[PDB]
Amino acid sequence: MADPIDVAMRQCLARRDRSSTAGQIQCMDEARQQWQGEVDAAYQRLVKTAPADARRGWQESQRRWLAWRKDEAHLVRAVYETTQGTMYAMASADMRLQPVRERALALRGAADRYAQPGGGKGAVHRVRPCMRDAACEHALFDMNRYYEKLRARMPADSRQTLVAAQREWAAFSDAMTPLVSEGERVDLIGARVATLKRFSETVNN
Template sequence: MLKSKNPLRAFAESVLRCALLVALSGAPLAAHAEAARADPIDTAMQNCSARADRSSTPGQVQCIEAARDAWQAAIDSAMRSIEGTAPDAARRGWQDSQNHWLAWRKEEAPLLRAVFATTRGSTYSITQANMQLQSVRDRALALRHVASRFAPPPAAAPAAPTSAASGASAATSGMMSGAVAAMASGARVGSDAPAVSSPVASRAQSDDARAHDERMRPCNVDAACEHAQFDLRRYERALRDKLPARARPALLRAQRAWKAYFDATAPLGTEAERVDLIGERVATIKRLSETVGND
């Protein structure tokens, strides 16, 4: 009778691990939720986690680590794009932001180890791997958006060749098609032609550009920013109070490095993106404060 329960228990633990992985991997911040749902990296990680030979805790962690490596490659690709297309001031700003992000990640690792050293149970290794993944994923999605803002517009498709028999009619048609395409992209056709924008894509782009051109208010006069900072301080206190005394310096160093990264990055974006940055940190610190000492 005892032997018959072991396979059921192993199966239940496997299901629990898979459910935990899916729940954590499917809980990105609201600012990036739409972009993340269909991303091939997320899909590959979920497919990996569903494989029979990855059903163990080490196997699940391997899937998460592979996804983290893929998101890191996405960060590197986005940074190369920014360095190649952004104006000099923006390029220097994002390079400085990336250097501070790397420094913060280095200080974050000891904090995660200190927190998870207080837990019991193999499934917490999955939680730890997911938390390491999430910050890399958030950064990759943010840098992809930045790279898309600075990327040059796609080249126009070459015109299809026409036969001699079509003559002037084809040439006129080609001129009309070119004019329509130019108008749709917001270009001017001739000296008096009005610019016509695409009703969806161009409006979204112009709204995004306008938001980045607006002067950023101080956080203490931006209600969303001030509230996010309040939450961050609240959960930081909760985490500090729960951590063993010997682990509190790791929290101090990690928060100091994150603040330097935040100060380098927030001025490069919009007020909404500034709140997103704080919100990402709130989510991490809150989860850590709820994890300390769990078994």
């Protein structure tokens, strides 16, 4: 079943008074704010129900997530201020929406797993090097490939915002590795690959 937030956004995008580009973006911005409320609520359930080791681990991940989001907004602006047109304005709005949605669903999945009998066990596990897992190694390889392509295509002024955003993303990624499955670890990297790839196809020097 679709989440009511996404059902509502769908209905919103169909509104007579939201057909303009500003109206479409406003629907997405309203959805993003609602997803941010679900981030905060799922994080609160998690802190109240998780075992102590996982609780501190997730608290660390959220501190790192927030710091990344703060600087990633600067990177989003630096990329899209070199663009023109409503296709790019829409892409930028979706850029802002999806990571909030993603963070909410991850927190929800953990809080649901910790809430049932047994599931709290094994919440924190040891960190194996990414290079043992060909899936992780391939995703990392692509990430650094698109990172370098993006860095080279950006105006010299904003390169420091990519450096800063990516560094805090990686610290967020590291905080998450002990708390999620190897598959989710790979998907965290794959999601960052897709963001950097889109940036590299968008920024205009």
